Design a protein around this ligand. Structure first.
Ligand SMILES: [Hg+2]
Ligand SMILES: [Hg+2]
Ligand SMILES: [Hg+2]
Length: 107
């Protein structure tokens, strides 16, 4: 499906912070909470891809883009962050803040 790919692309391209998630997903909730703790709400979009008729197509495309089909899948300014654990590594090692600083999202 070109349609599914274009829809996913629009989510990633029209939101600086794009998170693909599913219902009742503890590591989705943790990742989203970390990002909101940086006061990123205004530039964040969370898409629940389980509440979607094309979940499998979306997951397969997310795997083409990132190497994994699992949620959460996290993009920052179209760059692949990855999953919650990737976000935690970046956060703890200062890479996340650096990322956000270059975008003007944190001082
Ligand atoms: Hg679920
Ligand atoms: Hg949005
Ligand atoms: Hg994590």
């Amino acid at each position: 499906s070109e349609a599914v790919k274009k829809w996913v692309n629009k989510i990633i391209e029209e939101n600086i912070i794009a998170v693909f998630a599913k219902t009742e997903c503890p590591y989705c909730i943790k990742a989203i909470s970390i990002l909101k703790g940086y006061n990123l709400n205004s530039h964040m979009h969370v898409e629940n891809i389980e509440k979607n008729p094309d979940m499998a197509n979306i997951q397969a495309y997310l795997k083409e883009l990132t190497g994994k089909s699992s949620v959460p899948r996290i993009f920052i300014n179209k760059d692949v962050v990855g999953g919650c654990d990737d976000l935690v590594k970046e956060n703890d090692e200062g890479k996340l803040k650096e990322r956000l600083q270059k975008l003007g999202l944190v001082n």
